[PDB]
């Protein structure tokens, strides 16, 4: 009865289905896109109730074989709320934990940045961009001082990492919001279906990246609103845009 469900991002859900073809049982797993790191345990209809850190070792005629890793950290479906970004804000993501770290940015005055822990190839998921879900209207109606971490998820939803959670001392369940901007980025924001965070975005490399290299992404603000007037972006970004284009000739 083993059924494998691969998401477009490369992650998967795997396990014996119920008499009704649902992903419900005590030996179900979510497997990250590395096809190695897994969250193994209790799921109900594809939803993670208690997944323990595991390693997918081999598969035999469709059936996977996991080794349960040491430690006692459990994970569960824990979608953010308006009163709660996460039930366990200081419980890091284990896949992300292996691939990235936060340190001072190499970009001048840019604050903290996100760095690779390891050498990876192109097309590699590195970090997750979880946050509270809000509307584009609320975001457009407020000061930029509040919109440093807003990321458009879909047409209807914006993911945000509001104060205090933009600090690792308060939130480290995901680290996507720590990656700084570049017009020549080594990463892109891409869709991701996460078993703990739900549908969010991730940071995926565009090219090979070495260990201790800073991860950057194109923030992609609108450079030419219908509006009459020029890019709707924070001032620091407008300055960098001017400087970058001076290396291009406009």
């Amino acid at each position: 009865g083993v059924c494998w469900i691969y998401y477009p991002d490369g992650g998967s859900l795997v396990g014996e289905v119920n008499e009704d073809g649902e992903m419900t049982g005590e030996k179900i797993a979510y497997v990250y896109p590395d096809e190695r790191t897994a969250l193994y345990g209790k799921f109900i209809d594809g939803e993670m109730i208690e997944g323990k850190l595991a390693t997918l070792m081999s598969t035999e005629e469709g059936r996977p074989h996991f080794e349960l890793m040491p430690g006692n950290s459990v994970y569960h479906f824990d979608k953010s709320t308006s009163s709660c970004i996460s039930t366990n804000a200081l419980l890091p993501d284990p896949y992300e934990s292996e691939r990235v770290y936060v340190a001072e940015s190499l970009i001048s005055s840019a604050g903290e940045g996100l760095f690779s822990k390891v050498a990876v190839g192109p097309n590699t998921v590195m970090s997750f961009y979880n946050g509270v879900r809000i509307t584009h209207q609320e975001v457009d109606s407020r000061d930029w001082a509040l919109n440093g971490n807003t990321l458009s998820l879909d047409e209807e939803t914006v993911i945000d990492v509001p104060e205090p959670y933009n600090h690792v001392s308060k939130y480290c369940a995901s680290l996507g919001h720590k990656a700084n901007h570049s017009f020549t980025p080594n990463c892109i924001y891409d869709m991701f279906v996460h078993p703990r965070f739900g549908p969010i975005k991730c940071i995926r490399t565009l090219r090979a990246v070495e260990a201790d290299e800073e991860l950057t992404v194109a923030y992609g603000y609108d450079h030419s609103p219908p509006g009459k007037s020029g890019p709707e972006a924070p001032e620091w970004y407008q300055v960098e845009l001017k400087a970058f284009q001076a290396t291009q000739q406009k």
């Binding site: 584009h136 975001v139 919109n147 924001y189 923030y219 609108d222 219908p226």
Partner: peptide
Amino acid sequence: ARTKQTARKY
């Protein structure tokens, strides 16, 4: 829109 990867208008 005041966010990243904001949707374009056509």
